[PDB]
Amino acid sequence: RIIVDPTTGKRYSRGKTLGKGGFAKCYEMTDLTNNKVYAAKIIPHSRVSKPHQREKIDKEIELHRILHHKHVVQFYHYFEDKENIYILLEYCSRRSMAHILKARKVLTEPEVRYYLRQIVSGLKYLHEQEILHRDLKLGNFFINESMELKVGDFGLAARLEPLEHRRRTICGTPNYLSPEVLNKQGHGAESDIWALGCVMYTMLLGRPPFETTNLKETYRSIREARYTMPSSLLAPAKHLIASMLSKNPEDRPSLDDIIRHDFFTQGFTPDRLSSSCCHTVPDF
Ligand SMILES: CC[C@@H]1C(=O)N(C)c2cnc(-c3ccc[nH]3)nc2N1C1CCCC1
């Protein structure tokens, strides 16, 4: 099916569906004037009839469209017609880390380093733009044909705010509540670091350190920041976790500290991961 941008003339061809993405039905979409394929979110205006949800996509678009980095999903273009909003994004043929971890249960340490370095690279870029991601999770780490990771889905993302004027209410329903957010202190860069600690734990163990139901009954455990540290973890992995999930956000490492931790520096990390790793545990 041909889709024409009524503002420009520009023609696109819609391919196969890629699945549901919240407000969006997602599809392959080819720009006919370079012949490049994008992963597109197609959102009917009906799904955004309320002013707040209209503001929600507008914000996502506004923030995403200015980002350009190798480990951030590349925003291509957006337009609207009478029926839909179209957001064309970098096509990532190997799905997400959520799909990979579902298949693998647990990843090897060199793989954890491989993926984490790339997450840190993209997050660094974001934090220097003073943009907070606010929903870092495995499902938002998109993987391309060449096994390269891109951080995406900027649907809870916001610009950084000083504590004195900051939003103190929970924004959306993220995968990993910090202590500070649960203490009504709002979400800072350190809250993304939380969230990375939770990610690393999950990559190595296959389950999160705290419940992810976001039920009020879970709040005390998180805000204590007391959890099980399984013995199966190697010492450096344990130590790095342990710092990222510091109770006081001020005690958590910087992004530069994180990639220079013994967990990264004292182990093998290979330059390129094979696609078999979506599948099968790699060779020693
Ligand atoms: C468009 C939303 C999300 C996404 O944000 N990107 C960048 C993406 C890239 N490639 C793909 C992709 C290429 C081949 C299959 N999916 N998918 C992406 N998704 C999916 C679509 C359905 C749920 C999340």
What's the structural blueprint in terms of helices and strands?
Layout: E1 2-4, E2 11-21, E3 24-31, E4 36-44, H1 51-64, E5 75-80, E6 84-89, H2 97-104, H3 109-128, E7 131-132, E8 141-143, E9 149-151, E10 158-159, H4 179-182, H5 189-205, H6 219-223, H7 235-244, H8 255-259, H9 262-265
Antiparallel strand pairs: 1-2, 2-3, 3-4, 4-6, 5-6, 7-10, 8-9
The chain binds the ligand CC[C@@H]1C(=O)N(C)c2cnc(-c3ccc[nH]3)nc2N1C1CCCC1.
Binding site for ATP: 18-26, 41
Family: Belongs to the protein kinase superfamily. Ser/Thr protein kinase family. CDC5/Polo subfamily.
Subcellular location: Cytoplasm, Cytoskeleton, Microtubule organizing center, Centrosome, Centriole; Cell projection, Dendrite
What binds here, in terms of ligands, is:
ligand 1D1
Count of helices? 9
Identify the strand order in the major beta sheet. Answer: 1-2-3-4-6-5
Main sheet summary: 6 strands, antiparallel
Q: Outline, from the CA principal axes?
A: globular
- Helix content percent band: 25-40%
Number of domain units: 2
**CATH fold descriptor of the largest domain:** Transferase(Phosphotransferase), domain 1
β content, as a range?
15-25%
End-to-end distance: 47 Å
In the CATH hierarchy, what is the class of the largest domain? Answer: Mainly Alpha
Write out the CATH superfamily name of the largest domain.
Answer: Transferase(Phosphotransferase) domain 1
CATH architecture of the largest domain: Orthogonal Bundle
Work out the number of β strands.
10
The structural class is alpha+beta
State Rg: 20 Å
Protein name: Serine/threonine-protein kinase PLK2
Family: Belongs to the protein kinase superfamily. Ser/Thr protein kinase family. CDC5/Polo subfamily.
Keywords: ATP-binding, Cell projection, Cytoplasm, Cytoskeleton, Kinase, Nucleotide-binding, Phosphoprotein, Repeat, Serine/threonine-protein kinase, Transferase, Tumor suppressor
Subunit structure: Interacts with NSF; causing NSF dissociation from GRIA2. Interacts with CIB1.
